[PDB]
Coordinates of C-alpha atoms in Angstrom, one line a residue:
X1 CA -7.5 -129.8 17.9
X2 CA -7.0 -126.7 15.8
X3 CA -7.4 -125.9 12.1
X4 CA -5.3 -123.5 10.2
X5 CA -7.8 -121.4 8.1
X6 CA -6.3 -118.8 5.7
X7 CA -7.3 -115.2 6.2
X8 CA -8.9 -113.0 3.6
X9 CA -8.1 -109.3 3.0
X10 CA -10.8 -107.0 1.5
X11 CA -9.9 -104.4 -1.1
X12 CA -10.3 -101.1 0.9
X13 CA -9.8 -97.9 -1.0
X14 CA -10.0 -94.2 0.1
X15 CA -12.2 -93.1 -2.8
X16 CA -11.3 -89.4 -2.4
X17 CA -8.9 -88.0 -5.0
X18 CA -7.6 -84.5 -4.5
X19 CA -6.7 -81.8 -7.1
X20 CA -3.3 -82.0 -8.7
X21 CA -1.5 -79.6 -11.0
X22 CA 2.1 -78.5 -11.6
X23 CA 2.5 -74.7 -12.0
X24 CA 3.9 -71.7 -10.3
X25 CA 3.2 -68.0 -10.7
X26 CA 2.7 -64.8 -8.7
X27 CA 4.5 -61.8 -7.2
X28 CA 5.1 -60.3 -3.8
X29 CA 3.3 -57.3 -2.4
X30 CA 2.5 -55.5 0.9
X31 CA 1.4 -52.2 2.4
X32 CA -2.4 -51.7 2.5
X33 CA -4.9 -50.4 4.9
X34 CA -8.7 -50.1 5.0
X35 CA -11.1 -48.1 7.2
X36 CA -14.2 -50.2 7.1
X37 CA -16.6 -48.6 4.6
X38 CA -14.8 -48.9 1.2
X39 CA -18.2 -48.4 -0.4
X40 CA -19.3 -44.8 0.0
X41 CA -17.6 -41.6 -1.3
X42 CA -14.9 -40.7 1.3
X43 CA -12.2 -38.2 0.4
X44 CA -9.7 -36.8 2.9
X45 CA -9.9 -35.1 6.3
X46 CA -10.9 -31.5 5.7
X47 CA -11.2 -28.5 7.9
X48 CA -14.0 -28.5 10.5
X49 CA -16.0 -25.2 10.4
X50 CA -17.9 -24.0 13.5
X51 CA -21.6 -24.9 13.9
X52 CA -24.4 -22.5 14.4
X53 CA -26.3 -23.9 17.4
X54 CA -27.9 -20.6 18.1
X55 CA -26.6 -20.2 21.7
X56 CA -23.2 -19.5 23.3
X57 CA -23.5 -22.6 25.5
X58 CA -23.9 -25.1 22.7
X59 CA -21.2 -23.3 20.6
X60 CA -18.6 -23.5 23.5
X61 CA -19.8 -27.0 24.3
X62 CA -19.0 -28.4 20.8
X63 CA -15.9 -26.3 20.3
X64 CA -14.6 -27.9 23.5
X65 CA -16.1 -31.3 22.7
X66 CA -14.7 -31.4 19.1
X67 CA -11.8 -33.6 20.3
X68 CA -14.3 -36.4 21.0
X69 CA -15.6 -36.1 17.5
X70 CA -14.4 -37.2 14.0
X71 CA -13.0 -34.9 11.3
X72 CA -14.1 -36.7 8.2
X73 CA -17.4 -38.1 7.0
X74 CA -19.0 -40.5 4.4
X75 CA -21.5 -39.2 1.9
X76 CA -22.8 -39.9 -1.6
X77 CA -22.0 -38.3 -5.0
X78 CA -24.1 -35.2 -5.7
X79 CA -23.9 -36.1 -9.4
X80 CA -26.9 -38.4 -8.7
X81 CA -30.5 -37.4 -9.3
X82 CA -31.6 -36.5 -5.8
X83 CA -32.1 -33.4 -3.6
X84 CA -29.3 -32.2 -1.4
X85 CA -31.1 -32.9 1.8
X86 CA -31.3 -36.4 0.6
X87 CA -27.6 -37.1 0.6
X88 CA -27.0 -34.6 3.4
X89 CA -29.3 -36.3 5.8
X90 CA -28.4 -39.8 4.5
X91 CA -24.6 -39.2 4.7
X92 CA -25.1 -38.0 8.3
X93 CA -26.7 -41.3 9.3
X94 CA -23.6 -43.1 7.8
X95 CA -20.9 -41.2 9.7
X96 CA -22.7 -41.8 13.0
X97 CA -23.3 -45.4 11.9
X98 CA -19.6 -46.0 11.6
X99 CA -19.2 -45.6 15.4
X100 CA -20.1 -43.2 18.2
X101 CA -20.7 -44.5 21.7
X102 CA -21.2 -40.9 22.8
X103 CA -23.7 -39.6 25.3
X104 CA -27.4 -39.2 24.8
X105 CA -27.1 -35.5 24.0
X106 CA -23.9 -35.9 22.1
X107 CA -25.8 -37.9 19.5
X108 CA -27.6 -34.7 18.7
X109 CA -24.6 -32.4 18.3
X110 CA -23.0 -35.2 16.3
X111 CA -25.7 -35.0 13.7
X112 CA -25.2 -31.2 13.3
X113 CA -21.5 -31.3 13.0
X114 CA -21.7 -34.1 10.4
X115 CA -24.7 -32.7 8.5
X116 CA -23.3 -29.2 8.3
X117 CA -20.1 -30.8 7.1
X118 CA -21.8 -32.7 4.3
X119 CA -23.2 -29.6 2.7
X120 CA -19.8 -27.9 3.1
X121 CA -18.4 -30.5 0.7
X122 CA -21.2 -30.1 -1.8
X123 CA -21.2 -26.3 -1.8
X124 CA -17.5 -26.4 -2.7
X125 CA -18.1 -29.2 -5.2
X126 CA -20.9 -27.4 -7.1
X127 CA -18.3 -24.7 -7.8
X128 CA -15.9 -27.0 -9.6
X129 CA -18.7 -29.0 -11.2
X130 CA -20.2 -25.7 -12.6
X131 CA -17.3 -25.8 -15.0
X132 CA -16.1 -29.4 -15.4
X133 CA -17.8 -32.5 -14.1
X134 CA -17.5 -36.0 -15.6
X135 CA -18.7 -38.1 -18.5

């Protein structure tokens, strides 16, 4: 024997509606680059004045090891209430924090080259600020 029972289909739904809207807008654009900081005050590569290590060995060492060192650095605005050594020593920790991978001794000379560079920017800034600054 064999009966012929009718099947039953259950109402199955996805229950997951997606966003829908008809509209178009926008323009084309390209050509942009970023270093990595984009937060601190970084101008443009400036001249790199010699450092005063105190000896002839160190001087020659750096002068010859300048190729393995950066040219620019990152510091904060001197327009803020804070001693110079504050931003000078702080800005130095940033530049070296961006990347070094140098030797154990290099890390030392790297702090001087950067530090001495920070002040060089302020000293020249104070001159222009002495006349006109900003609101």
